[model samples]
Target: SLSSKLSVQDLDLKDKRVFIRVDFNVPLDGKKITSNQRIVAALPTIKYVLEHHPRYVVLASHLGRPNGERNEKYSLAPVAKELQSLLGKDVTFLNDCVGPEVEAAVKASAPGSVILLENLRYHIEEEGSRKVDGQKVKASKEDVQKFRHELSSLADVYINDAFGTAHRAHSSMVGFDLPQRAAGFLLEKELKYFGKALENPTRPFLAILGGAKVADKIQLIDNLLDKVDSIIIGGGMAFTFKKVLENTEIGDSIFDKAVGPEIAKLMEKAKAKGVEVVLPVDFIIADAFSASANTKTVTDKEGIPAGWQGLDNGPESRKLFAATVAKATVILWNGPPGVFEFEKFAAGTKALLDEVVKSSAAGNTVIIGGGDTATVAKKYGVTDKISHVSTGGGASLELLEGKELPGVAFLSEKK
Candidate 1:
């Protein structure tokens, strides 16, 4: 299904200035990068584009949430250095992303050279042009036209490799006014794997949904009700489900009371649809919400004492989750099952991930959706063992919800 879109390989890049929109939103500690996975993920596409001997390569990305203002702290200067070290070539750096100065620099760059554009978030129109409140707000149609024109004029070809921002319809990501556009290698790979899971996944598809709120995953649950064979629920949201059906005491567990009735109905729907639903039978309850708090594993779901919080799954629940994972032919894990950042509460998530890695080793398709889970995979150093680790959290969620990504929708279709 993803094959209908044009790819970077479908374009002729010889002597062309190829503008690439990449995801360089790596974590930073001052000027030093804490992790370079995002930068590393875009390497294959960058190298492939370079191999074509294009007239010039223009790399652009948005770092941190600057809210469309120039901020020195959110600069991409360190990324350029990191990229240059990886490519083993001199990279020209521009102080601005879209402007006369940037365009002039790109025009002056020699063939086969690479130039790193400053953060795209410096421009307000990058994210603010399209309103989100079911209303329209603008800096005039003429202003948008000129902005798009200036950006498009810098390169003959446009390639979007920022899968992390695919769900968003920004000026750089969509390039609606740009005549030439294609999906870069990373984006193509992301689409291919996601398409495999959603379109033609192997039998016994299992979905692991976690995180804090039921509202965050409601759309995903609705979409996968038919596609997945079983749904495993954990994290704080599981307590809300327990309260609705069994009137279980969840203690001080975090959950949105507004979605309680809806989640109860959703569970009923899943049973009617013949989809197996798994919920945590036990929990690791703590007196306080801290790593060093007094913790106890409670097997009775209805017995969580007052003034305590369920922070993670218990030993029995971990075994139950692992058993289900072992038999699953296709597994998709998004959020972690507990507060994994803390050392004491990380056991549940780490244990489940171990089983997921084992499942992958058995040749089953195992995909780890980005954000927290991706960070967990990196922390455990098991990303290479999984079938696919998505780069975009929101984008991956939207794709799984069977929604079209605005950035991908704007790409040139295969003829």
Candidate 2:
């Protein structure tokens, strides 16, 4: 039987500078946090580390896409303030992630105190995996090792609670080779839920997939074909399947040109395995791809008129999706069935979530696995109704694809 990897409790952390990599990449409205869910999700690990009485509880995270430059708008000052309120303890907010100032602050901090570093993306080397200026520059091992060592030297222990970036092989994630490394509680929970769904799920496992492009979900769909008993495809991705039909005219609908053959092969494979593959029977078409574009619902996939794009699933599709969801013992939904950002086209996704809530109440294990889907669930006030809402969008998809996460791989092995 498989077991979980080492956790933060596996290492002795007393009087230690425990560097915790967290995912505080939240939306900010001019230094005001719009969502504190990320901060709240990380509280368990943060509180646990504090209880351990570490010399300094060092928190590191990147907010927004500031690139490799320091931007005040992307600063974690507001996050620090919010976290202090949530934890009910004063937290020291540093201006730099790695520098003399950070070093001094950590050194001067007393045990059980919390210190949050500024955005890690402020340093170019943090994303060392990629090259700048579209060209690779040769650098000495000393130059590369300089940044990694600086971070590793500060922490007596490393705890990665940022499951959101588990798939990313960044400097802070997989660059440093720390002797005392472990998965924090959030990451542990992420692994545990995904592991159970993939390894030993209840009978009649179902997966609902939707997004803008079929290309984005090809690998995930291929992986799920082997695991799930039923698969439902919706959103703009359904247009690609509609394109496969003889009389279907996709018009201006979004369809991946390269994924046609692949989708056909996947459908064939699903049929061979007796896995039911469900595609949207109808779609809400628009004259143009805009929130207020002239819209109409096409009850049949072949009825999509020319010069129109399908922006959301139609009423018929929602009913079919809901009925299919009701029979599943295990459920995993990623992405949305429509343009959830626009209020008018959000009905399909809203109705689907309502059915998912009913299914959850009926004893089905339902997991929502994406940022957009989680946000939509929260918008509909149904997030708490589901079994799990994954913190990592790409990380969860990578796991569903049967891929190993570099951040997780860097952790200490279980004895």
Candidate 3:
């Protein structure tokens, strides 16, 4: 179903200045890259392109928010070094993304050499806006065109491999002039996995939703209601739902007063649609939000006391969730069931993840969405055990919400 867009393999890269947009936004400690997972992910596309002996495989990516200034802290110099070590070759790191100087350097670069451009966020025109001293500022209309034009001039063809930033409509994503456009292997894979799971998933599809707030996931829940057969509400979000449903006390927990009525409405809709809504019956309540805090396990019948907070699911609820997970053939987990950042509250998420891993190994489809859950997978060393661990957070959510991504829409359609 995702084969409608052109792929990198579909292109003829012989002697062409192939420009690629990659997501190399890995965590950094000074100049050292903390995680090279993202760099490793881009290898298939870059390596495949190199096999054709491209004149220059120009790689572009944004490191951090530099706010249109040449900030040393937000530079891509460290990523260039990491990429070079991973690719086992010398990578020419340019200091600028768009200008006569950068164009000359790119043109003069030897054939068969990889070149990584400086941070794309160096110019506000790339993002079309930035903040100056906590105030919003927009780039000039004329300058935006120049930035896009200058960057487009460096390439003979374009390939979008940065699915992480696909939700954003930035210049590097959509401003390319090269008519020859396609998707890298990573982007293609993202579309294929998410497409299959969302559009035409296997029976007994289970959707797991978590995180700190219910207001943030209201739209996502509404969208998944149409697709998934069952939904599991966890994290602090379940507290809000439980409070609204049974008029229980949810003290020291996040409760979105604005989304009070929407919870009931959504539940009614789910009931009317014959969709099952599962919430945690018990929780690990804490007296303080710290690792050494006084903690106790309690069920909804006991009710979260006025001064206590539900930080994690209780032992009984973990088994309850695992039972439901065992019944589902297709599982999609987006957030952690507990406050996994703290070691004291990580048992619920870890236990649940172990079950998901077992399900995956037993031949069920298991997909882990990005952000908190992705980090959780790595923490528990279960990244490889899942069916697909997403590289994009906002992008994947946008697709799941039945919305088209700007970068994805810009790719050339297949012949």
Candidate 4:
């Protein structure tokens, strides 16, 4: 419904200059981009706008935390280069994103030309959501309003294609709106998948949650528990559930003693509501945290020997998880079943990613909802096989939790 209501297709761009907010904040090792997946994700929206023959496509984005200073390490140069390579065209790069110079740079772009503005964080205004010190860009409500007006003034219409930054309430994410904002193709795709999996998913929808923190996923599990056919738990966070089920001693394997009782309440509620909550039936325990430490599968949650820790789901657990994964009409997976960064304990996640690929190949909808799970999917070389590998980890989780995003708030709505 979100996608159906707002989209890039709704905008008319004959000779208009379009200012688009895109998430090009990719991880980098020096000047080289460590990941091109997010860059590739925006190609559809970028190329679609280019094809529309807009007067100019003025792009905006922010990079890593340079602490509101002009740090070369956080420059958007790599992003600009990646975009040029992905789009197979020259993208003019500016040294700034606001005021006269940047405005001139955007205005100088010829019809159908694309221009990428420098990192927004370079200006102190971005971090505090307002301007400060340099060039009299003060940090205030009026300052944010003025900057947003200046930024959006470069274009006749505004389009946001950044799925990764959709959860933030920063100026660029929610500021550019005066009856001239629209959602780009990528944003529409994000909301589309969210709506499909959360609101109108086909029968047997299963949400697989994992990773190290119980705090991050508790809200999502709570939000979708009733709608999902089953919720599968894995990763270090599973210890909390183990604790709830049977007051288990999970030897430094990531436990949340505080939420133990709450976890028990959730399990009881799931059972009473006839909803299945799946936990790892077995685990790969290690005597030490090192990858070379001796390890084996433990069937009983409370039976881990002294000085041993559970790092991943065991082989049998993987099989059970794969079976459950394959049967779902819509499978939403986030996080890994193990410390997948270490190859020794990666089997559980590898098996799950392989099953996701197989499920996708078998015509079942397999959606990887980002976080370490997306990393697992990528690490296993099945990134392209799944239906969608979300660009944003926190953003995807918030959407799964049924939260409204600031990135989508500024866009022109379908009335």
Top candidate on TM-score is 3
List model 4 lDDT by residue over 291-314, tens digit each.
Answer: 666456554443344333466666
| lDDT per residue as tens, model 1, 125-229 | 443456675343444555656656666667777777876444656656644354677777777776776666666555666767655554446666566555646
Residue-level lDDT tens digits of model 2 in 222-323: 776566464554444434445454324434333555555666676677777655666665667655566666455554343334333466766866877786
Model 2, residue 375: C-alpha shift (Å):
3.7
Per-residue lDDT tens digits for candidate 3, residues 85-114, read 776666776644555577787778665444
lDDT of 4 at 90: 73
Backbone clash tally for model 3?
0
lDDT of 3: 0.64
Worst 10 residues of 3 by lDDT: 245-254
**Whole-model lDDT per candidate:** 0.64, 0.64, 0.64, 0.61
For candidate 4, what's the RMSD? 4.3
How many steric clashes between backbone atoms does each model show? 0, 0, 0, 5
Off by over 4 Å in 3: 1-8, 27-30, 67-74, 118-136, 233-254, 289-304, 307-309
Please provide TM-scores, in order, for all candidate models, with all chains considered together: 0.82, 0.81, 0.84, 0.82
Off by over 4 Å in 1: 1-8, 26-34, 65-78, 95-102, 116-140, 217-220, 224-226, 231-255, 291-304, 307-309, 412-415
